[PDB]
Amino acid sequence: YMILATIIANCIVLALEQHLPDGDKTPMSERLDDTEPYFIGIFCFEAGI
Amino acid sequence: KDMLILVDVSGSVSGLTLKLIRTSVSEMLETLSDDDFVNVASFNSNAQDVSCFQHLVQANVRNKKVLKDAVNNITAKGITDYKKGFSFAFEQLLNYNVSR
Ligand SMILES: *[C@@H]1O[C@H](CO)[C@@H](O)[C@H](O)[C@H]1NC(C)=O
Ligand SMILES: *[C@@H]1O[C@H](CO)[C@@H](O)[C@H](O)[C@H]1NC(C)=O
Ligand SMILES: [Ca+2]
């Protein structure tokens, strides 16, 4: 269930991202891109188990 | 006046917004007389002058055409930084070594 919750959190983070034309990035996109390593770590943890 | 027209040529203004910005800057220059001094600067994570001018130049016909061509040749790319653009603008408005 914790895996399910982190998966839903990843989906919410993906939904929250906004894409700008020519290299521009929203200030929130920086935070939502820095939150990735937590998700990759938890998915590596489930894979390891 | 002493304008510094700060133009936001970042990624997010690509396409229609850039077209409107450049037409708007041209029509803004078209309200500047010969007693007004103007520079046009553009910023995307770092600010620069759009043209060969490095300081507020007189807003006469030839300088205004230089600035209009520099604005028409401008492109949208990069992230925005309103601090490095306003630093540039305020610094250029404090340049008293030139005619103003
Ligand atoms: C002005 O236009 C020319 C013609 O394409 C281009 O090569 C040049 O890069 C433009 N100026 C700037 C500052 O990009
Ligand atoms: C103006 O001249 C002074 C002294 O020559 C110099 O220190 C300064 O950097 C120049 N530019 C501005 C924008 O004040
Ligand atoms: Ca922007």
mmCIF file of N, CA and C in Angstrom, chain B:
data_model
loop_
_atom_site.group_PDB
_atom_site.id
_atom_site.type_symbol
_atom_site.label_atom_id
_atom_site.label_comp_id
_atom_site.label_asym_id
_atom_site.label_seq_id
_atom_site.Cartn_x
_atom_site.Cartn_y
_atom_site.Cartn_z
ATOM 1 N N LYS B 1 11.201 61.348 -21.813
ATOM 2 C CA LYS B 1 11.311 60.055 -21.160
ATOM 3 C C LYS B 1 12.750 59.557 -21.155
ATOM 4 N N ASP B 2 13.000 58.565 -20.300
ATOM 5 C CA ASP B 2 14.178 57.698 -20.375
ATOM 6 C C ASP B 2 13.663 56.269 -20.262
ATOM 7 N N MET B 3 13.238 55.682 -21.375
ATOM 8 C CA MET B 3 12.814 54.293 -21.320
ATOM 9 C C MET B 3 13.988 53.342 -21.375
ATOM 10 N N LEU B 4 13.833 52.230 -20.679
ATOM 11 C CA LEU B 4 14.474 50.984 -21.061
ATOM 12 C C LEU B 4 13.355 49.981 -21.275
ATOM 13 N N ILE B 5 13.136 49.605 -22.529
ATOM 14 C CA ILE B 5 12.147 48.589 -22.861
ATOM 15 C C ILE B 5 12.763 47.229 -22.559
ATOM 16 N N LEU B 6 12.258 46.566 -21.527
ATOM 17 C CA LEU B 6 12.679 45.214 -21.197
ATOM 18 C C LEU B 6 11.762 44.230 -21.903
ATOM 19 N N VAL B 7 12.333 43.422 -22.784
ATOM 20 C CA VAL B 7 11.587 42.440 -23.556
ATOM 21 C C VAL B 7 11.898 41.068 -22.986
ATOM 22 N N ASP B 8 10.856 40.271 -22.771
ATOM 23 C CA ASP B 8 10.991 38.946 -22.177
ATOM 24 C C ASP B 8 11.017 37.905 -23.288
ATOM 25 N N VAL B 9 12.186 37.732 -23.897
ATOM 26 C CA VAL B 9 12.360 36.702 -24.931
ATOM 27 C C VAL B 9 12.881 35.459 -24.221
ATOM 28 N N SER B 10 11.961 34.727 -23.616
ATOM 29 C CA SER B 10 12.231 33.412 -23.066
ATOM 30 C C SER B 10 11.446 32.392 -23.875
ATOM 31 N N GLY B 11 11.536 31.128 -23.474
ATOM 32 C CA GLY B 11 10.848 30.092 -24.221
ATOM 33 C C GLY B 11 9.349 30.298 -24.256
ATOM 34 N N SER B 12 8.776 30.750 -23.142
ATOM 35 C CA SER B 12 7.330 30.794 -22.979
ATOM 36 C C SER B 12 6.646 31.825 -23.864
ATOM 37 N N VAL B 13 7.392 32.706 -24.528
ATOM 38 C CA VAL B 13 6.790 33.718 -25.385
ATOM 39 C C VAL B 13 6.864 33.335 -26.857
ATOM 40 N N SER B 14 7.237 32.097 -27.164
ATOM 41 C CA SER B 14 7.424 31.693 -28.549
ATOM 42 C C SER B 14 6.107 31.719 -29.312
ATOM 43 N N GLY B 15 6.199 32.032 -30.590
ATOM 44 C CA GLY B 15 5.047 31.963 -31.490
ATOM 45 C C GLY B 15 4.280 33.286 -31.542
ATOM 46 N N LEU B 16 3.053 33.275 -31.024
ATOM 47 C CA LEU B 16 2.182 34.441 -31.116
ATOM 48 C C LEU B 16 2.592 35.530 -30.139
ATOM 49 N N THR B 17 2.956 35.148 -28.916
ATOM 50 C CA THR B 17 3.304 36.145 -27.915
ATOM 51 C C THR B 17 4.525 36.942 -28.344
ATOM 52 N N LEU B 18 5.517 36.285 -28.945
ATOM 53 C CA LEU B 18 6.687 37.013 -29.425
ATOM 54 C C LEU B 18 6.322 37.977 -30.544
ATOM 55 N N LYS B 19 5.437 37.559 -31.446
ATOM 56 C CA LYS B 19 4.986 38.439 -32.517
ATOM 57 C C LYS B 19 4.311 39.678 -31.950
ATOM 58 N N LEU B 20 3.422 39.477 -30.979
ATOM 59 C CA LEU B 20 2.755 40.602 -30.339
ATOM 60 C C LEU B 20 3.741 41.477 -29.580
ATOM 61 N N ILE B 21 4.723 40.876 -28.908
ATOM 62 C CA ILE B 21 5.710 41.663 -28.174
ATOM 63 C C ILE B 21 6.534 42.518 -29.120
ATOM 64 N N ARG B 22 6.950 41.967 -30.258
ATOM 65 C CA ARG B 22 7.791 42.760 -31.146
ATOM 66 C C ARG B 22 6.990 43.859 -31.835
ATOM 67 N N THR B 23 5.748 43.573 -32.236
ATOM 68 C CA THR B 23 4.908 44.640 -32.773
ATOM 69 C C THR B 23 4.626 45.702 -31.715
ATOM 70 N N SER B 24 4.425 45.279 -30.466
ATOM 71 C CA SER B 24 4.153 46.212 -29.384
ATOM 72 C C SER B 24 5.362 47.082 -29.083
ATOM 73 N N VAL B 25 6.564 46.510 -29.134
ATOM 74 C CA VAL B 25 7.765 47.304 -28.905
ATOM 75 C C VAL B 25 7.980 48.283 -30.050
ATOM 76 N N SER B 26 7.679 47.871 -31.283
ATOM 77 C CA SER B 26 7.763 48.816 -32.393
ATOM 78 C C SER B 26 6.787 49.973 -32.212
ATOM 79 N N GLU B 27 5.543 49.675 -31.835
ATOM 80 C CA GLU B 27 4.559 50.733 -31.631
ATOM 81 C C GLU B 27 4.838 51.553 -30.380
ATOM 82 N N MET B 28 5.583 51.000 -29.427
ATOM 83 C CA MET B 28 6.028 51.766 -28.271
ATOM 84 C C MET B 28 7.129 52.737 -28.657
ATOM 85 N N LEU B 29 8.067 52.286 -29.488
ATOM 86 C CA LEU B 29 9.096 53.174 -30.006
ATOM 87 C C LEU B 29 8.492 54.272 -30.865
ATOM 88 N N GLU B 30 7.413 53.969 -31.581
ATOM 89 C CA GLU B 30 6.767 54.972 -32.420
ATOM 90 C C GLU B 30 6.082 56.082 -31.630
ATOM 91 N N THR B 31 6.109 56.051 -30.300
ATOM 92 C CA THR B 31 5.619 57.154 -29.482
ATOM 93 C C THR B 31 6.737 57.928 -28.808
ATOM 94 N N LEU B 32 7.979 57.693 -29.201
ATOM 95 C CA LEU B 32 9.123 58.352 -28.597
ATOM 96 C C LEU B 32 9.607 59.459 -29.519
ATOM 97 N N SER B 33 9.741 60.660 -28.970
ATOM 98 C CA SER B 33 10.178 61.817 -29.731
ATOM 99 C C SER B 33 11.697 61.928 -29.650
ATOM 100 N N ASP B 34 12.234 63.053 -30.112
ATOM 101 C CA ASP B 34 13.677 63.235 -30.168
ATOM 102 C C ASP B 34 14.259 63.685 -28.839
ATOM 103 N N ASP B 35 13.423 64.152 -27.919
ATOM 104 C CA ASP B 35 13.862 64.507 -26.582
ATOM 105 C C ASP B 35 13.896 63.313 -25.644
ATOM 106 N N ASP B 36 13.285 62.200 -26.035
ATOM 107 C CA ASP B 36 13.295 60.977 -25.251
ATOM 108 C C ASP B 36 14.497 60.131 -25.632
ATOM 109 N N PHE B 37 15.068 59.460 -24.642
ATOM 110 C CA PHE B 37 16.173 58.541 -24.849
ATOM 111 C C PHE B 37 15.713 57.138 -24.493
ATOM 112 N N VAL B 38 16.093 56.165 -25.311
ATOM 113 C CA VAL B 38 15.544 54.822 -25.201
ATOM 114 C C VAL B 38 16.637 53.796 -25.455
ATOM 115 N N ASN B 39 16.570 52.695 -24.722
ATOM 116 C CA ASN B 39 17.278 51.475 -25.055
ATOM 117 C C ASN B 39 16.300 50.321 -24.936
ATOM 118 N N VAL B 40 16.536 49.275 -25.714
ATOM 119 C CA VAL B 40 15.731 48.065 -25.657
ATOM 120 C C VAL B 40 16.642 46.933 -25.216
ATOM 121 N N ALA B 41 16.297 46.299 -24.102
ATOM 122 C CA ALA B 41 17.047 45.175 -23.571
ATOM 123 C C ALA B 41 16.145 43.955 -23.508
ATOM 124 N N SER B 42 16.745 42.786 -23.671
ATOM 125 C CA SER B 42 16.020 41.527 -23.640
ATOM 126 C C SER B 42 16.699 40.587 -22.660
ATOM 127 N N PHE B 43 15.903 39.838 -21.900
ATOM 128 C CA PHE B 43 16.440 38.973 -20.859
ATOM 129 C C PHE B 43 15.823 37.585 -20.932
ATOM 130 N N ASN B 44 16.678 36.564 -20.840
ATOM 131 C CA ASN B 44 16.264 35.177 -20.613
ATOM 132 C C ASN B 44 17.385 34.504 -19.816
ATOM 133 N N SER B 45 17.251 34.542 -18.489
ATOM 134 C CA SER B 45 18.236 34.018 -17.542
ATOM 135 C C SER B 45 19.486 34.888 -17.510
ATOM 136 N N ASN B 46 19.572 35.848 -18.427
ATOM 137 C CA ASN B 46 20.588 36.891 -18.435
ATOM 138 C C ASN B 46 20.165 37.942 -19.447
ATOM 139 N N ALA B 47 20.344 39.205 -19.089
ATOM 140 C CA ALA B 47 19.862 40.307 -19.903
ATOM 141 C C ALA B 47 20.957 40.828 -20.819
ATOM 142 N N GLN B 48 20.544 41.261 -22.006
ATOM 143 C CA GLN B 48 21.452 41.814 -22.994
ATOM 144 C C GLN B 48 20.707 42.876 -23.784
ATOM 145 N N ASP B 49 21.466 43.745 -24.438
ATOM 146 C CA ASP B 49 20.873 44.702 -25.356
ATOM 147 C C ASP B 49 20.522 44.011 -26.664
ATOM 148 N N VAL B 50 19.349 44.341 -27.205
ATOM 149 C CA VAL B 50 18.934 43.739 -28.462
ATOM 150 C C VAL B 50 19.770 44.236 -29.630
ATOM 151 N N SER B 51 20.387 45.409 -29.504
ATOM 152 C CA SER B 51 21.063 46.045 -30.626
ATOM 153 C C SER B 51 22.507 46.385 -30.296
ATOM 154 N N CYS B 52 23.150 47.153 -31.172
ATOM 155 C CA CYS B 52 24.521 47.580 -30.944
ATOM 156 C C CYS B 52 24.640 48.621 -29.842
ATOM 157 N N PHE B 53 23.538 49.244 -29.435
ATOM 158 C CA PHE B 53 23.582 50.253 -28.389
ATOM 159 C C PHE B 53 23.804 49.601 -27.033
ATOM 160 N N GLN B 54 24.692 50.194 -26.242
ATOM 161 C CA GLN B 54 24.969 49.726 -24.893
ATOM 162 C C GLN B 54 24.456 50.689 -23.833
ATOM 163 N N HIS B 55 23.708 51.712 -24.230
ATOM 164 C CA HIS B 55 23.246 52.743 -23.313
ATOM 165 C C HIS B 55 22.043 53.429 -23.939
ATOM 166 N N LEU B 56 21.329 54.201 -23.123
ATOM 167 C CA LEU B 56 20.179 54.952 -23.609
ATOM 168 C C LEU B 56 20.589 55.893 -24.731
ATOM 169 N N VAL B 57 20.113 55.631 -25.940
ATOM 170 C CA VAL B 57 20.401 56.477 -27.080
ATOM 171 C C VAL B 57 19.201 57.374 -27.332
ATOM 172 N N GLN B 58 19.435 58.464 -28.054
ATOM 173 C CA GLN B 58 18.347 59.356 -28.414
ATOM 174 C C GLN B 58 17.345 58.622 -29.289
ATOM 175 N N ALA B 59 16.069 58.936 -29.106
ATOM 176 C CA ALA B 59 15.016 58.274 -29.870
ATOM 177 C C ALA B 59 14.672 59.088 -31.117
ATOM 178 N N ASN B 60 15.656 59.211 -31.998
ATOM 179 C CA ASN B 60 15.435 59.784 -33.312
ATOM 180 C C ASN B 60 15.193 58.658 -34.309
ATOM 181 N N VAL B 61 14.887 59.035 -35.550
ATOM 182 C CA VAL B 61 14.352 58.075 -36.511
ATOM 183 C C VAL B 61 15.341 56.944 -36.766
ATOM 184 N N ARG B 62 16.629 57.264 -36.881
ATOM 185 C CA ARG B 62 17.590 56.251 -37.293
ATOM 186 C C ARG B 62 17.880 55.286 -36.149
ATOM 187 N N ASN B 63 18.049 55.823 -34.938
ATOM 188 C CA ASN B 63 18.231 54.981 -33.760
ATOM 189 C C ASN B 63 17.001 54.125 -33.510
ATOM 190 N N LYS B 64 15.816 54.706 -33.689
ATOM 191 C CA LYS B 64 14.589 53.942 -33.527
ATOM 192 C C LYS B 64 14.483 52.827 -34.553
ATOM 193 N N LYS B 65 14.963 53.045 -35.780
ATOM 194 C CA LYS B 65 14.960 51.950 -36.747
ATOM 195 C C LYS B 65 15.965 50.871 -36.369
ATOM 196 N N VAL B 66 17.130 51.261 -35.854
ATOM 197 C CA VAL B 66 18.081 50.262 -35.367
ATOM 198 C C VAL B 66 17.426 49.389 -34.307
ATOM 199 N N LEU B 67 16.751 50.028 -33.354
ATOM 200 C CA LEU B 67 16.103 49.285 -32.282
ATOM 201 C C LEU B 67 14.960 48.427 -32.813
ATOM 202 N N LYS B 68 14.203 48.936 -33.785
ATOM 203 C CA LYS B 68 13.104 48.162 -34.350
ATOM 204 C C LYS B 68 13.611 46.926 -35.079
ATOM 205 N N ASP B 69 14.693 47.061 -35.845
ATOM 206 C CA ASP B 69 15.270 45.899 -36.512
ATOM 207 C C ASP B 69 15.813 44.899 -35.501
ATOM 208 N N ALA B 70 16.453 45.392 -34.440
ATOM 209 C CA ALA B 70 16.966 44.496 -33.412
ATOM 210 C C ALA B 70 15.838 43.741 -32.723
ATOM 211 N N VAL B 71 14.695 44.397 -32.524
ATOM 212 C CA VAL B 71 13.543 43.725 -31.929
ATOM 213 C C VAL B 71 12.941 42.721 -32.903
ATOM 214 N N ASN B 72 12.866 43.072 -34.185
ATOM 215 C CA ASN B 72 12.301 42.142 -35.157
ATOM 216 C C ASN B 72 13.177 40.910 -35.332
ATOM 217 N N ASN B 73 14.482 41.041 -35.120
ATOM 218 C CA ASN B 73 15.410 39.925 -35.242
ATOM 219 C C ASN B 73 15.532 39.114 -33.957
ATOM 220 N N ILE B 74 14.654 39.322 -33.000
ATOM 221 C CA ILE B 74 14.820 38.738 -31.677
ATOM 222 C C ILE B 74 14.147 37.372 -31.664
ATOM 223 N N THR B 75 14.664 36.463 -30.840
ATOM 224 C CA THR B 75 14.184 35.090 -30.813
ATOM 225 C C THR B 75 13.894 34.666 -29.381
ATOM 226 N N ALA B 76 12.980 33.712 -29.243
ATOM 227 C CA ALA B 76 12.532 33.230 -27.945
ATOM 228 C C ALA B 76 13.237 31.924 -27.610
ATOM 229 N N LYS B 77 13.902 31.891 -26.457
ATOM 230 C CA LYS B 77 14.659 30.725 -26.030
ATOM 231 C C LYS B 77 15.120 30.941 -24.598
ATOM 232 N N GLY B 78 15.114 29.874 -23.807
ATOM 233 C CA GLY B 78 15.673 29.923 -22.473
ATOM 234 C C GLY B 78 14.656 30.224 -21.397
ATOM 235 N N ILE B 79 15.135 30.172 -20.159
ATOM 236 C CA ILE B 79 14.297 30.372 -18.986
ATOM 237 C C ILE B 79 14.329 31.847 -18.603
ATOM 238 N N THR B 80 13.321 32.280 -17.853
ATOM 239 C CA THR B 80 13.189 33.676 -17.464
ATOM 240 C C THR B 80 13.871 33.947 -16.131
ATOM 241 N N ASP B 81 14.420 35.154 -15.998
ATOM 242 C CA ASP B 81 14.986 35.635 -14.739
ATOM 243 C C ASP B 81 14.667 37.124 -14.647
ATOM 244 N N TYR B 82 13.602 37.461 -13.917
ATOM 245 C CA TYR B 82 13.195 38.852 -13.781
ATOM 246 C C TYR B 82 14.161 39.672 -12.942
ATOM 247 N N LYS B 83 15.096 39.032 -12.247
ATOM 248 C CA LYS B 83 16.061 39.759 -11.434
ATOM 249 C C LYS B 83 17.263 40.213 -12.247
ATOM 250 N N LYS B 84 17.775 39.350 -13.122
ATOM 251 C CA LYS B 84 18.896 39.710 -13.978
ATOM 252 C C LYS B 84 18.492 40.619 -15.128
ATOM 253 N N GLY B 85 17.199 40.752 -15.402
ATOM 254 C CA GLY B 85 16.736 41.690 -16.401
ATOM 255 C C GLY B 85 16.499 43.052 -15.795
ATOM 256 N N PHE B 86 15.909 43.080 -14.603
ATOM 257 C CA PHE B 86 15.690 44.357 -13.942
ATOM 258 C C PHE B 86 16.980 44.942 -13.386
ATOM 259 N N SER B 87 17.942 44.101 -13.000
ATOM 260 C CA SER B 87 19.261 44.618 -12.660
ATOM 261 C C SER B 87 19.865 45.356 -13.844
ATOM 262 N N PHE B 88 19.798 44.743 -15.025
ATOM 263 C CA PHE B 88 20.316 45.363 -16.239
ATOM 264 C C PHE B 88 19.589 46.664 -16.549
ATOM 265 N N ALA B 89 18.259 46.652 -16.446
ATOM 266 C CA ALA B 89 17.478 47.845 -16.752
ATOM 267 C C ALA B 89 17.818 48.989 -15.807
ATOM 268 N N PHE B 90 17.841 48.711 -14.503
ATOM 269 C CA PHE B 90 18.131 49.758 -13.532
ATOM 270 C C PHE B 90 19.561 50.257 -13.668
ATOM 271 N N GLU B 91 20.501 49.364 -13.983
ATOM 272 C CA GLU B 91 21.876 49.798 -14.199
ATOM 273 C C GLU B 91 21.982 50.704 -15.415
ATOM 274 N N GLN B 92 21.266 50.378 -16.490
ATOM 275 C CA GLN B 92 21.312 51.224 -17.676
ATOM 276 C C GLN B 92 20.635 52.562 -17.439
ATOM 277 N N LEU B 93 19.647 52.615 -16.549
ATOM 278 C CA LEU B 93 19.052 53.902 -16.217
ATOM 279 C C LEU B 93 19.928 54.741 -15.297
ATOM 280 N N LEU B 94 20.959 54.153 -14.696
ATOM 281 C CA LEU B 94 21.922 54.876 -13.878
ATOM 282 C C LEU B 94 23.186 55.248 -14.637
ATOM 283 N N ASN B 95 23.243 54.979 -15.937
ATOM 284 C CA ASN B 95 24.414 55.301 -16.747
ATOM 285 C C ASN B 95 24.320 56.766 -17.140
ATOM 286 N N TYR B 96 24.989 57.630 -16.380
ATOM 287 C CA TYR B 96 24.974 59.062 -16.641
ATOM 288 C C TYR B 96 26.170 59.530 -17.457
ATOM 289 N N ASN B 97 27.039 58.614 -17.882
ATOM 290 C CA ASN B 97 28.151 58.964 -18.754
ATOM 291 C C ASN B 97 27.703 59.343 -20.156
ATOM 292 N N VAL B 98 26.441 59.105 -20.503
ATOM 293 C CA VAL B 98 25.950 59.287 -21.859
ATOM 294 C C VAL B 98 24.889 60.380 -21.859
ATOM 295 N N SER B 99 24.592 60.879 -23.055
ATOM 296 C CA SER B 99 23.516 61.844 -23.219
ATOM 297 C C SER B 99 22.194 61.226 -22.792
ATOM 298 N N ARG B 100 21.396 61.999 -22.065
ATOM 299 C CA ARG B 100 20.132 61.505 -21.544
ATOM 300 C C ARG B 100 19.145 62.651 -21.433
#
